[PDB]
């Protein structure tokens, strides 16, 4: 007999109080507007789109959610801009200038000692 977790998707209480709900691996005919079927369950309260954005809130199986277009919407995730390299059999590209960059990396080293 059907059963599964229930998760709540929120843009943050400092943005809005709208919410969508995912019923994990529940068929959309056995749940009891905007109902969207994903391989992870049924998503209700989120408008599905065709465009593709950067992932914000990960849902699963390639589906993410975002607060953009306001109620709350869904969409697929984009791996990143597309670019063709201008390859040929006698062409080269060489830089004529440069920049110096600085980046951070953070690593933990210890915990509190308990007894």
């Amino acid at each position: 007999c059907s059963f599964g977790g229930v998760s709540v998707i929120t843009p943050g209480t400092n943005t809005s109080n709208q919410v969508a709900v995912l019923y994990q691996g529940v068929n959309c005919t056995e749940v009891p507007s905007n109902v969207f079927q994903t391989r992870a369950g049924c998503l209700i309260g989120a408008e599905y789109v065709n465009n593709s954005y950067e992932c914000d809130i990960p849902i699963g199986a390639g589906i993410c959610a975002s607060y953009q277009t306001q109620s709350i919407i869904a969409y697929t995730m984009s791996l990143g801009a597309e670019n063709s390299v201008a390859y040929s059999n006698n062409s080269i590209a060489i830089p004529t200038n440069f920049t110096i960059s600085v980046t951070t990396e953070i690593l933990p080293v210890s915990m509190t000692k308990t007894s």
């Binding site: 007999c1 059907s2 059963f3 599964g4 977790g5 229930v6 998760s7 709540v8 998707i9 929120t10 843009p11 943050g12 209480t13 400092n14 943005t15 109080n17 919410v19 709900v21 995912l22 019923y23 994990q24 529940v26 056995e30 749940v31 809130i57 990960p58 849902i59 959610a65 607060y67």
Partner: protein
């Protein structure tokens, strides 16, 4: 009319001070955004606590009445407040059906056996509940259709009364020269305390999915993301049972209408073992004059399972049917048929005229009159030797002080009830050591499909 509460009926669940601590509590509250009846009067139910708000600068509400019967012959609570202060009182009253110079108090006309005494625009809120014989009141008076806001209510009284309540009424000050009624339900909230220790906000943990997230995280501010808060569980409907057909029927059918029964001194013993026994044909027949079911109840015969069943059958007089019982005495118990002191079956007997009586006398039925020593439980004698009551042997010849031991019943149809023949069938159940035998039919049954079911 009805109105919509907003966040009302929140009271301090207990003592215990506290600081900045998003504490979670379970208790009897008025749910947020609830459906509260409106009154501008009749006896109302209680069922579990009461929310009571009102609005008015003057004082129209002049006490309440509580209890189970709201009448005399039993004790009740009465709360009044004149221009002095609140007066709790618990007596047996006699209330006016319409209770209400400047003279007043025409509410009751009796105050017997008092077990408690005490003496001493605008929004006046109250919360009433009654738990383990304690009648609690919370209240607060805050100056300004109700508005919108949050305010926690503090304990007012502590009353060790013991009183039961199922209904109550209200009292109003008439003109001679507006209130709310909610009820409480078991809910869970997440309460926010300030540094002074007061409740400043709350979350109803059984309303909006966002509130369930707040309650699980123990916060009133949730950061953007996705949170697992609970679970979905489909529930089964109906109870489908499905047992086999039937097959046999344990032939009680022929034991009860056999065309001849035996004399009481030579009774019968049928032992049905391999059976599905349906005692409903017995119980729902009911022409019976006696039915004494001793060890087990006449209703639970269709849910047990024994190893053996022994059914006896004989014909006796009417005023001897009472000797068929565990622990008895008489010519029938001692010499003919004795039931043990630990009997676990059940005797069933019915009248047998028109099939046993005979105009002229039916001497086919006999019984034993003289025996040297009483019988044993479930023993049977068929001896025809001549009893000897004297001191001389008679060599199997009747005469003086030597009697024939088997006398006869002379059943005629123009007898009196209590001398007419009766057919008796005593049943006896036992479970020796065999791990299956006769037991009744399960009961109803059916089927369905494509549905989550039990």
């Amino acid at each position: 009319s009805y109105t919509n509460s907003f966040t009302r009926g929140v009271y301090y669940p207990d003592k215990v001070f506290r600081s900045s601590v998003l504490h979670s509590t379970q208790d009897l509250f008025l749910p947020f955004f609830s459906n509260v009846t409106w009154f501008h009067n009749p006896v109302l139910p209680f069922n579990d606590g009461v929310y009571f708000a009102s609005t008015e600068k003057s004082n129209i509400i002049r006490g309440w009445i509580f209890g189970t019967t709201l009448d005399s012959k039993t004790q009740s609570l009465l709360i009044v407040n004149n221009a002095t202060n609140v007066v709790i009182k618990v007596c047996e009253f006699q209330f006016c059906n319409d209770p209400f110079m400047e003279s007043e108090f025409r509410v009751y006309s009796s105050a017997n056996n008092c077990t408690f005494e005490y003496v001493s625009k605008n929004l006046r809120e109250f919360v009433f509940k009654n738990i383990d014989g304690y009648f609690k009141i919370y209240s607060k008076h805050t100056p300004i259709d109700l508005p919108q806001g949050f305010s926690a209510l503090e304990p007012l009284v502590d009353l060790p009364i013991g009183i039961n309540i199922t209904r109550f009424q209200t009292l109003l000050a008439l003109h001679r020269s507006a209130y709310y009624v909610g009820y409480l339900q078991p809910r869970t909230f997440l309460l926010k305390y300030n540094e002074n220790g007061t409740i400043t906000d709350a979350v109803d943990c059984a309303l909006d999915p966002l509130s369930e997230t707040k309650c699980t995280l123990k916060s009133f501010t949730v950061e953007k993301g996705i949170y697992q808060t609970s679970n979905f569980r489909v529930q089964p409907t109906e109870s489908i049972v499905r047992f086999p057909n039937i097959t046999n029927l344990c032939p009680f059918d022929e034991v009860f209408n056999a065309t001849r029964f035996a004399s009481v001194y030579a009774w019968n013993r049928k032992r049905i073992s391999n059976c599905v026994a349906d005692y409903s044909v017995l119980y729902n027949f009911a022409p019976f004059f006696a039915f004494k079911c001793y060890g087990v109840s006449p209703t639970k015969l269709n849910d047990l399972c024994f190893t053996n069943v022994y059914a006896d059958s004989f014909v006796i007089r009417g005023n001897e049917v009472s000797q068929i019982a565990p622990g008895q005495t008489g010519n029938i118990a001692d010499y003919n048929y004795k039931l043990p002191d630990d009997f676990t079956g059940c005797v069933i007997a019915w009248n047998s005229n028109k099939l046993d009586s005979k105009v002229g006398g039916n001497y086919n039925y006999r019984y034993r009159l003289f025996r040297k020593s009483n019988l044993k439980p479930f023993e049977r004698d068929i001896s025809t030797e001549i009893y000897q009551a004297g001191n001389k042997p008679c060599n199997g010849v009747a005469g003086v002080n030597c009697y024939f031991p088997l006398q006869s019943y002379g059943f005629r149809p123009t007898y009196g009830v209590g001398h007419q023949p009766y057919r008796v069938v005593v049943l006896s159940f036992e479970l020796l050591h065999a791990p299956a035998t006769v037991c009744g039919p399960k009961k109803s049954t059916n089927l369905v499909k494509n549905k989550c079911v039990n």
